[PDB]
Design a protein around this ligand. Structure first.
Ligand SMILES: Cn1c(=O)c2c(ncn2C)n(C)c1=O
Ligand SMILES: Cn1c(=O)c2c(ncn2C)n(C)c1=O
Ligand SMILES: Cn1c(=O)c2c(ncn2C)n(C)c1=O
Ligand SMILES: Cn1c(=O)c2c(ncn2C)n(C)c1=O
Ligand SMILES: Cn1c(=O)c2c(ncn2C)n(C)c1=O
Ligand code: FES
Ligand code: FES
Ligand code: FES
Ligand code: FES
Ligand code: FES
Ligand SMILES: [Co+2]
Ligand SMILES: [Co+2]
Ligand SMILES: [Co+2]
Ligand SMILES: [Co+2]
Ligand SMILES: [Co+2]
Lengths: 344, 344, 344, 344, 344
């Protein structure tokens, strides 16, 4: 509904590069993806990742059932070929005739970063960037891109689940927190460069596995849905970074991505993947049970919900500012609001 | 919604006690149930059966995914603990802060009777009672509670199917009626104490199994959806009672309950259970086929439809009286209307 | 619904005679079918195929769960018996009482032809006929009725797929066309007696199987959805006829019928059936991908789309004429419009 | 085991012609079949149906995964081509070299008759013929070949089930016999030309469907597993022929064939197919329950079992005679033994 | 069993390191594997990969259902702890008593190499080594370990399929060879250091995909089941290495491993993985059809089968030498037999 239009102005991940390469035996795509209820197709056309509407201009077949040919995407039905700008450049049935002026499909800003493919549906405000991942190009850290995981929950509810200090004791007792560490601190939160920044020192000496990323937590949250969590672990005295971002596929579904990086990397990737998967399996049934899918005004917050409250407040401001136009939105997103004592 | 609001004032069964005990290994619940399209949770807190909306006040997680701890139902997400009145009495994240006054969920009338759990969503008219089961506390009779059975049919259509004299010869020829006995009598019907009361002396000497409850039929039907049928059986000269009641789960679904009692009880419970299941299997495809799900005004009645006609008329009066308020509803439900020669 | 009302005036196939005879052990039906989102029942009563709304006038049970009893269709619930005109002639519960005037269900035109059962929902314009199959009662030809095939695509899109000259090279390269023969001719198209008639000499010497019906193509397309394609095959110098017609089951679905006839018939029926199934398997994914299901005004045509363009034009004229009434519709359907040199 | 060797000398059906044509899109086969635990392949090579062992001489691949090429069967692995005599005639890898003398596979006598494909594994005694079907080439009769049906029972037990007069009342009460007609007559049985011949006049006026083939029964049973039953029906005064034969696939499995012919043929084939399928569904669970699969010496016969007793006696004689050689076997099979008063 | 005993003297791969790390959340195992019908367990104890019989000495529980605890493998039933030598070092029920001398399980050679785990069941001849992979520690090459693929075919038949020059034209026509290139050369074969070495210049200019490893083929085949194929590709003038090895799981099954390395590595791993999977899908049905599973003496060879013929000859020599003992086996395996012009 109208509520969601403002989200079209952000970059969202739609697939891993691995998913694109696996989709078709050519390794070039095409791959069908869905973002904010739009049916799109991604393909590697020459040196560029390209996103188009997954709908041929001729007779509305899905281009995602087609083939990459040179630097073009060829429709399966009558072979029309589309260039990187979504323009048809070949109509095989009519090689001599002029190509109709309207023989084109919409294309969208599309970039690879961190091993994911990102799409921005509306670029007209031109003030948003791909989220920040702190571990990129840090040679001290081994990076693992997990396979995406799908939840029957919204990106807003997923974000709040990831940053929620209060649930660890109840949803993750064997795994992330002691069940008796249920009272979290109230942390200062800064807005800077379109990111929420805040720091949380979790309890020490908790009976949790050594591969649990538990320690001093530094969050950099690129609004609206990306979370970069840098952990200085207590047990190993080493850096562990979690980068989690949700693709808002439609009104009730998320395709979620986790990339994690670690300084101590002589151990098995699957030690960590299995642990992450366990954490997600603990969250999933409870988060999918939340109803209605979008948080209504009747939910009852407590002081420990500060992160959730401030998140909802900023999202509300972004939605209102989007209605006022590009300049208002840019200010709402990028104006600093500092409440900690840190330098910037 | 509007057409069904009056049904919120009655007691409806939502599960058997056995279902509640089996739902969770604690034997205390919780169990998710649905009544009139409302999502509810049932649990046993101490000596009390409780029913609440299945939605935590904090972040809307389902309490039915939580845990009973003595006299509390604990939400699975952040561990809020609700007492028997639906009030949160512990917020683990803020154990010293005052609990918000809004931290409460709607609590509904919930009572065990006859081995079923009954819920009344609205008690404001204070004039409805749990349906009458004649065999309760008759020490002459052995009582068996069947597992519930789900039909893709409404409670009104199920009620009419149960009391329909004309269909026996076509739906139950091997089983309840001779295929020749298609013409039923037109019987007097009395309203008394919120019940329809009527008697039907079925045909004798029909080629049906001895466990068929066929004989003199005395109906006591607690409006809107319960039927107590006392059979003085021809074949065994002994009493057999069928108590059938439909939970209106939503606009197209019923969860149905059968409790039956018998005076001759030296035989197997499963002789009777299998017979009841055969009868229901004969009804099910035809009743599920009726469309639209609610009887529309264009259905064509004949004189043999008296029970159906009178039932529809009383339901319409109750709907209309509910709009006029508590006193009008009490009169529509509880005023006597006597057609027969009996006194009550 | 509103856009589709004009389609109710045509004869559409709903099942094969084989399907009707297999539906029930009596071989007389009843069989439930769906046409233009209407739920219907088909049965053979005496010598007549009948079609009625699949909904008893009494309590709305499905007559398709009932039984043919001589010259009657009997409802399963209370045994009301309907004659070939849809009128109830027996109410078993009240066999002496007058039958209500309202005890009737809607009866529709229903006729067997070519081994299919055809239904016309609206006969008020009295100007449509069952489509033309040229091989009927041609003793030189062996006729095979294939089993129906269901597609998640509309009847309009299926028709255009069948008559589309341009896609053969991309969808059927191994099978019907050389992949290099992508440029089709622009052929004259005649409207005559409610049929599109046109001829297409396909390319010779293509590397296609001997059982591929490739040759001189003569189309007689009974509007709106039936195609009679007479092929004078290059490879065998013999006649092969394809008759394809789509049942518009609802807004997203077709039940499609293929009947084929051949002059050289000493070979296996299954050589041809397997080839037809291969062609259909090649088309199915691409046609089911077209979205939205109904072609929007934004589709971009090229000159090679003449058949599709002219088809859409005639359908629009018929939809417009239907709003103006019976004589306007008759004119739009049956007036001749001749482009070619041929004489009719 | 050794018990079964004698069965290799008879013709057995292995598939319908329809199954062969459907197996491969060429309609020529190949089709894998199994007979007396031998893995065979059938193909149409030119004008001939050919059966070979399903095992290439080169590297033991299954020829049934190959292709018919001209009048040869081509192995899928390295393309060796086998002629109608099982001889390899092309080794693609070594076109100039002589083909090895041992490059051949066993072939077996293979013929089409009545729309089935028949194989005789051992032709060395040269005294057996394909079973007799009385309706072949009788233009008064419409013939229907049913799809094969598979049972977990032996061909001997299937034969005895088909000719058993005593079970109709218990396995087929609604369907073939009145439940009170349980006492059958003791009929004379003749051996003539390798066939058991006997006649049985079933009870009249039984409450069975009109499509039930009930009447005067004349059996011609080509030993060991084929039954030709000619029924002069009581209800319709018309001829109905049932031809049933079992393929002994292995020690515990049969692939069974039914062909039926009828003089009154204006009705639906599927009336009869559905009835036959119902009969088979009534027999199947009981016959599959018989254990051990081969009848042991401890079974207890009664006088009503005459047909079964005489069948087992003749099979025993054939098994013993096979051990004594070709002349003894020919006499055991073809010597007449007459006990009725009929002409031959 | 008897025929296969000699295979116990070689190193066979049983799982990838990835499979071991994924088996249990600890990433240390245990993992159940099967080799030559032996049930084994693999675990990482400290720095060592260990393999034991998967059967506790106490009450025969599977150790693969247990847990790694530091330098011990702990049985799930009564917690006996086994050291890297298969000796029990803790009996929790009797922690003071002497541990029985019989409280030990069989321990087998187990080593990681190339990302696979290798087991040698019998080390008594002390003359076999883990197979040679030429790309190991070649920094010019990117290495990809595929997931294992399981075939219902033996290791011998899989080896012959991989090195078979003749089948490419029939099994892989679109994919590896022109269908016309059916005649292979007869190449010299050298035995050196327990390897078969031979070179094959495949045909140039074939219509095969660019990612097809087609070019100059140099085989180094570590007996009995590992093949190292170095391809100097015609199409890219670059090195591509295929390392394929079969685990003989039991008498009918192989778990197969492919590792591939490539010099031009800027392209997608999944271009190559998809192509390898296509090749394997083309081979699988034909190789699984070969019967009996072990090649019998009756198979008929042609001159083009030189590689297969020489392979079977060497395997027979090794089986014969094994019966004569350690020094005979060492000689048969490691003595050089040079046919070519090359120098080693
Ligand atoms: C929210 N969240 C996670 O989701 C998570 C985690 N470690 C692993 N995961 C997967 N930590 C520490 C965490 O806070
Ligand atoms: C409606 N109804 C039943 O549903 C029924 C029954 N006996 C068993 N059942 C289950 N009888 C007598 C009956 O009238
Ligand atoms: C559209 N179409 C078909 O669908 C078809 C065909 N031959 C078989 N089929 C099934 N031909 C020639 C054809 O043009
Ligand atoms: C054994 N048998 C049948 O199996 C059968 C049948 N009619 C149909 N079937 C199928 N009859 C009359 C019969 O005797
Ligand atoms: C046997 N074989 C293969 O199995 C193969 C291959 N390339 C990929 N695969 C998988 N080549 C060239 C090959 O000869
Ligand atoms: S629908 Fe894409 S080319 Fe025609
Ligand atoms: S949602 Fe229930 S405690 Fe938070
Ligand atoms: S619903 Fe059809 S007879 Fe009653
Ligand atoms: S296995 Fe048949 S040709 Fe080689
Ligand atoms: S069976 Fe292993 S410790 Fe007992
Ligand atoms: Co969580
Ligand atoms: Co009923
Ligand atoms: Co097509
Ligand atoms: Co039988
Ligand atoms: Co191969």
């Amino acid at each position: 509904n109208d509520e969601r239009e403002y989200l079209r102005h952000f970059w969202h991940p739609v697939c891993t590069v691995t998913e694109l390469e696996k989709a078709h035996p050519s390794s070039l795509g095409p791959l069908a993806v869905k973002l904010l209820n739009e049916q799109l197709v991604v393909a590697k056309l020459g040196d560029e990742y390209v996103a188009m509407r997954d709908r041929c201009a001729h007779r509305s077949a899905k281009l995602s059932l087609g083939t990459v040919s040179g630097n073009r995407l060829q429709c399966p039905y009558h072979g029309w070929q589309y260039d990187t700008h979504g323009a048809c450049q070949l109509v095989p049935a009519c090689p001599n005739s002029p190509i109709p002026n309207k023989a084109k499909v919409d294309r969208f800003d599309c970039e690879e970063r961190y091993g994911l493919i990102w799409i921005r549906l509306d670029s007209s405000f031109d003030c948003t960037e791909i989220p920040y991942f702190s571990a990129a190009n840090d040679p001290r850290l081994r990076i693992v891109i997990q396979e995406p995981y799908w939840w029957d929950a919204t990106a807003e509810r997923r974000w709040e689940n990831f940053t929620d200090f209060s649930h660890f004791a109840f949803i993750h007792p064997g795994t992330l927190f002691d069940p008796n560490n249920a009272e979290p601190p109230i942390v200062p939160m800064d807005r800077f460069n379109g990111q929420f920044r805040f720091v949380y020192d979790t309890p020490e000496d908790m009976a949790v596995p050594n591969q649990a990323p538990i320690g001093s937590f530094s969050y950099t949250c690129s609004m609206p849905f990306a979370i970069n969590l840098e952990v200085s672990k207590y047990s190993s005295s080493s850096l562990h970074v979690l980068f989690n971002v949700s693709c808002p596929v439609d009104s009730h579904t998320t395709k979620n991505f986790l990339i994690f990086a670690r300084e101590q990397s002589d151990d098995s990737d699957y030690l960590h993947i299995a642990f992450n998967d366990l954490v997600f399996a603990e969250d999933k049934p409870v988060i999918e049970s939340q109803w209605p899918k979008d948080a209504p005004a009747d939910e009852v917050s407590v002081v420990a919900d500060k992160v959730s409250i401030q998140y909802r407040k900023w999202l509300r401001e972004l939605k209102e500012a989007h209605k006022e136009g590009s300049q208002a939105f840019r200010s709402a997103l990028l104006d600093p609001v500092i409440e900690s004592d840190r330098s910037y």
